[PDB]
Amino acid sequence: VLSPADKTNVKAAWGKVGAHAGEYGAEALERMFLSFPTTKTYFPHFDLSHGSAQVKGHGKKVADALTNAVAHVDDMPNALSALSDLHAHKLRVDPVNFKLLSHCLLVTLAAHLPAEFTPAVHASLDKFLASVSTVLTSKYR
Amino acid sequence: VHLTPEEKSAVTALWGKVNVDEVGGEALGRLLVVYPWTQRFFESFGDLSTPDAVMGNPKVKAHGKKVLGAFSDGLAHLDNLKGTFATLSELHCDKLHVDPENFRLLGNVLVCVLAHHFGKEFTPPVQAAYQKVVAGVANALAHKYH
Amino acid sequence: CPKPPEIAHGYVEHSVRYQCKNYYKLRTEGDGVYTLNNEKQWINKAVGDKLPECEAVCGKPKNPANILGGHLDAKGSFPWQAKMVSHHNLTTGATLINEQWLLTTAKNLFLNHSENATAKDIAPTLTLYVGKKQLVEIEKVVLHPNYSQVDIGLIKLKQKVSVNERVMPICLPSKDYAEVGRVGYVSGWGRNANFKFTDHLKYVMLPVADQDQCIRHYEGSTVPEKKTPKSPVGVQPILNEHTFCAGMSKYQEDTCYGDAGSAFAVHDLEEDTWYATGILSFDKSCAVAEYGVYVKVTSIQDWVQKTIAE
Amino acid sequence: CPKPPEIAHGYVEHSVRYQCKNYYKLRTEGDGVYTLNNEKQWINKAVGDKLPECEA
Amino acid sequence: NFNIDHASVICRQLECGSAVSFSGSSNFGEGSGPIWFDDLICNGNESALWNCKHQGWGKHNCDHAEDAGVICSKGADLSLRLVDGVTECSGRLEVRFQGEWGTICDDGWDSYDAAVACKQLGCPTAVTAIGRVNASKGFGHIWLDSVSCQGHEPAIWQCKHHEWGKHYCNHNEDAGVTCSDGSDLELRLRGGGSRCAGTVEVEIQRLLGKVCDRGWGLKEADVVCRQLGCGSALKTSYQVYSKIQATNTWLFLSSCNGNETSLWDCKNWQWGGLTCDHYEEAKITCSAH
Amino acid sequence: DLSLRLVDGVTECSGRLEVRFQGEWGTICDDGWDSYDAAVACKQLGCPTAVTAIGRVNASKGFGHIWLDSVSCQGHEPAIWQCKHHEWGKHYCNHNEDAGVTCSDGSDLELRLRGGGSRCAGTVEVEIQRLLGKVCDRGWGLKEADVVCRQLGCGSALKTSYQVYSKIQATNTWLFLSSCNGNETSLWDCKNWQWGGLTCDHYEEAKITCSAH
Ligand code: HEM
Ligand code: HEM
Ligand SMILES: *[C@@H]1O[C@H](CO)[C@@H](O)[C@H](O)[C@H]1NC(C)=O
Ligand SMILES: *[C@@H]1O[C@H](CO)[C@@H](O)[C@H](O)[C@H]1NC(C)=O
Ligand SMILES: *[C@@H]1O[C@H](CO)[C@@H](O)[C@H](O)[C@H]1NC(C)=O
Ligand SMILES: *[C@@H]1O[C@H](CO)[C@@H](O)[C@H](O)[C@H]1NC(C)=O
Ligand SMILES: [Ca+2]
Ligand SMILES: [Ca+2]
Ligand SMILES: [Ca+2]
Ligand SMILES: [Ca+2]
């Protein structure tokens, strides 16, 4: 339920992230792996060692998808149509894991960029990530 | 038992740097604006409609001191957590009826608040120990429920 | 029977009263006074040979009331909710209509099955948990004749369930309570704000909403030619004249996954009885969309009665 | 006396009424409908503890 | 609408004592006669139910089988006692509820609660501990749990008890009390070169034990070192000159400010009733060694 | 009409599956394939089911709609179309991965070691239906490696590395398997072993030196 004032903060806050989005996504992926060990079961062949290239590579594509979603904030389900099918129909990722990644991503943004995370921005960026998780998991069964 | 000695040292170390006066008000103010269904329980604290009023309300800040101190008291001994929070858990279960999830949500917000206040020092292994601490406290305050 | 005390110059003929146990309601035409006769079988004048029946009470919980958030159900104010667990531990709710029958949605019974799976495949695996934790074994799973237009399915239990203080059926209304502004209570067994299935029953009041802005929010327009799929969650709800939409609460609370089959119960203050006005069908809105789709009970009241009779 | 027929989920409050002996008339003002109680002694509301008796 | 505080006002009118709880349907006895109050709710501030608010005056909505009844604590056969201790003022507490003897859960037990129990039993309350001594875990229903008392009360029944028969706590832990006059308590250091260095050995009512190392530190060590009259504390270890014996009872310390005159004045020190296998015996080496 | 046929295989008893339904041909996605399902498939083909493998033999991906996806069979079934399948004509797999069916009479399968000084030690090589092949070393461990040594009668297995002597010819079709208990005698006794259909750039040919070298 992103209000027009809520989307303005999301676009502005994501803009201040800049080119460091790919590294932020990679750090969040690594942060969630060690903090929630059960999450590693969904990555069978990926190397889970700290600083791995695949983790860095995966973080870049995850942040790429989110940055695409911000530019298409009005129409999210179409911009995330391919990812929704892969995450729900192929890998059958449980929806509980998405709230873990969203929390870890917010922590990474808050720690690395503390000055811009006013409480107004925190709520707006939280609602944006909740919208992404629901879209991806809306066809889980 | 629950935590390795190296993990325990870092958790106790960071808790020294904290500003108890302001951290408690910060986390409570964030939960009341991010998840706006907890404003029902805090109607005794006055106006809470707008985020600045939530942050600037003296009552939530004072209640933040109580929440933070109880967290520090819980950190005194982990195995006692069942007995440490038994007195408080009854209040949150029979009088206010606070759902156990809100304990898990407040703890998660606390991790974000601590990360915001500290920065790079919130090393991913450090937050992993903190989440294990938070999960136990949320379970301990909910184990009274039956 | 106990021997009556002896009296001087009198022969005794017996006439006993019949009363149903509490939490049940007596169903008989006569007073229930049963008179002993020469044939030794007790008879009431109006009831004749048939024994009076003790049926369940509708929608009269011992503790009356005042998911993402909501209020914890601590007093057991919703004794008609029943959890249903599928193969993969994908729990789901289900309401209790009659003493032996439950009500849910069709898509709840298609989990891990094909869209045309027969009733015989679904039956062995559905695990109902009505009451506190009382497991119940089912016998039949009836779907709607049009499962593509009304997501409703009836479940028959092997034997009747005792009506305790934590188990009570809620029967169907005689009129329609789906008028905009009618605030109703929804109990849920589904995901919470962390998307993990709730271990405690929660509930929240949701108001009914105008069914034009609900369709325009989902299907783009009320004109069939200009309808386009623009559901903000990526899944199109099943919308037709047998549905009504309920928005969020005051504190921005709604229903996420796993809450299908729950009852949109409204409190009829004049009669002090809880009536089921709608059954949650599209629960995937969570906090992204602004309207949840509920199947109207009145539209399926005729069909439900026919199935129960058989 | 034979037990009254049982009803599902229902309780039966036993009660017996005294019919006056032939050639006699009930002296007591009560009709004589005794009802079984938890204390095993049947009681009519009008006659109370005193048992009904029929006179010529 | 019958309430626990509502039942408290009721039993106060009989002037017998406090009530265990509010009860409904009058399970003990069948009602008789007309009734004047229906769905009665009371705040508890009022001295009597007559000053308490009544939903209806001169009428009752509940039938005689549904009308409530009152069970009172003084009427119940409740009597506190101590079982299996070093003396009659030490051991595991017992509460006789409904004719069945049960223990008290450890959770919520405080020094204030121990002070009330010692006053109730009858032997001096000069020094009170919150642990059971030399006793084994009992069998039965744990009638009391999370007993939170202010301390200045005549009996623990009047004290705010959570619920009669909750039994949530495990039966391994049971609340105990140590009522001492203050003369039997003694502390000594053994197994070292001098009296000021060694392993902390306690002797309460002629029972010898040790001190657990759960919260033992330098700050808590100054209290012991000062108490023995051997200056302050330097090191937590010592050099072994002889072998101390083996003891089974352990003293557990919560926290100390560091300025206390004696170890007995530290708040909430538990004597016995618990085992710390992972932790070792607490040692100390005073500066006057 | 239903008709499942093997194509692009070495023989008629092994090849990539091709299923016609409604009158249109297609291939099955490899996801959900099990050795028991392939055993049921061989019953439809009529080929002997003494040894059955889930691999696809040197066959291309082709071009066609994936009619059946996530087919789950346990073996005691008349045909695989009786087993439950995820949707009909709806798929989300990659087009390259096709379900493979290999039916073996039991005599064609042979195991040999080449490139070493003795017959007991060398690069593991598998010959199935006169098709030359190697073994990818994903699951490869010492305890499954004893089966290869035991099958050849060359005692136990000591180490995976072996001393090169002569070069070995390169092959395209590759075999790999999850794991082996070690209680068995033949490699074919290991269950759910795939024979072709994928390549290993991360992983290389498995080698062994047995004790009887
Ligand atoms: C906002 C949340 C998420 C976003 C934006 C996201 C995005 C992506 C992207 C861009 C890919 C790459 C797909 C490709 O390269 O073809 C991917 C793959 C994947 N996703 Fe996520 N993801 C999210 C959450 C999750 C979570 C929480 C999990 C597991 C707990 C998960 C499981 C996976 C896995 C295992 C892959 C690997 C697929 C492969 O290697 O082929 N996703 N995701
Ligand atoms: C998660 C760990 C929590 C801790 C350690 C904690 C601690 C405390 C403490 C010590 C008090 C006592 C204050 C007093 O007696 O004056 C209190 C009061 C209260 N807490 Fe919590 N709290 C927690 C979570 C929550 C949450 C998430 C809520 C959400 C609404 C909540 C709602 C309340 C309320 C309404 C009161 C007021 C009680 C009253 O007015 O009588 N608590 N809290
Ligand atoms: C408590 O000590 C006494 C002697 O003081 C002893 O008789 C008794 O057995 C002890 N209780 C136990 C070991 O449970
Ligand atoms: C000891 O210090 C504490 C604070 O640590 C203080 O409350 C207490 O009054 C002090 N006692 C004395 C006797 O100075
Ligand atoms: C697979 O091998 C067989 C047998 O040699 C051959 O007939 C067929 O053409 C081969 N297919 C490809 C694609 O090489
Ligand atoms: C497989 O190994 C197990 C022990 O892991 C053994 O009990 C069993 O007999 C073996 N099966 C065979 C040799 O067929
Ligand atoms: Ca305890
Ligand atoms: Ca207490
Ligand atoms: Ca595959
Ligand atoms: Ca299968």
Numbering used by the authors:
A (entry chain D): 2 to 142
B (entry chain E): 2 to 147
C (entry chain F): 33 to 98, 103 to 346
D (entry chain G): 33 to 88
E (entry chain B): 187 to 475
F (entry chain C): 263 to 475
How do the authors describe this structure?
Circulating haptoglobin acts as a primary defense by binding to free hemoglobin, forming a haptoglobin–hemoglobin (HpHb) complex that is then recognized and cleared by the CD163 scavenger receptor on macrophages. CD163 belongs to the scavenger receptor cysteine rich (SRCR) family and is a type I membrane protein with a short cytoplasmic tail, a single transmembrane helix, and a large ectodomain consisting of nine class B SRCR domains. Here we report the cryo-electron microscopy structures of human CD163 in its unliganded state and in its complex with HpHb. These structures reveal that CD163 functions as a trimer, forming a composite binding site at its center for one protomer of the dimeric HpHb, resulting in a 3:1 binding stoichiometry. Widespread electrostatic interactions mediated by calcium ions are pivotal in both pre-ligand and ligand-bound receptor assemblies.
The cryo-EM map of the complex, obtained at a resolution of 3.3 Å, enabled us to construct an atomic model that clearly demonstrates CD163 and the dimeric Hp(1–1)Hb bind with a 3:1 receptor-ligand stoichiometry. It also shows that only the Hp SP domain (HpSP) and Hbαβ from one protomer of Hp(1–1)Hb, termed the HpHb triad, interact with the three subunits of CD163. In contrast to the asymmetrical assembly observed in the unliganded CD163 trimer, the three subunits of CD163 in the CD163/Hp(1–1)Hb structure arrange in a nearly 3-fold symmetry, resembling a triangular prism with an overall dimension of 160 Å × 220 Å × 140 Å. Here, D5–D9 from each CD163 subunit join together to form an enclosed base near the membrane, stabilized by interdomain contacts between neighboring D7 and D9, while D1–D4 of each CD163 extend upward to embrace the HpHb triad. This interaction positions the HpSP domain at the apex of the complex, with Hbαβ nestled below between D3 and D4 of each CD163. At the top of the interface, the HpSP domain contacts D2 of CD163-I. Here, the positively charged Lys262 from the edge of Hp forms electrostatic pairing with the negatively charged Ca+2-coordinated acidic cluster Asp186 and Glu252, while Arg252 nearby makes a salt bridge interaction with Glu216. Directly below HpSP, the Hbα subunit forms contacts on its opposite sides, bridging the D3 domains from the two CD163 chains, CD163-I and CD163-III, together. Lastly, Hbβ engages with D3 of the remaining third chain, CD163-II, through electrostatic pairing of Lys83 with the Ca+2-coordianted acidic cluster Asp293 and Glu359 of CD163-II. The CD163–CD163 interface at the bottom follows the same pattern of Ca+2-dependent electrostatic interactions that recur between D7 and D9 of adjacent subunits. Indeed, the three subunits in the CD163/Hp(1–1)Hb complex show a significant shift in their relative positions, primarily through concerted swing motions at the base.
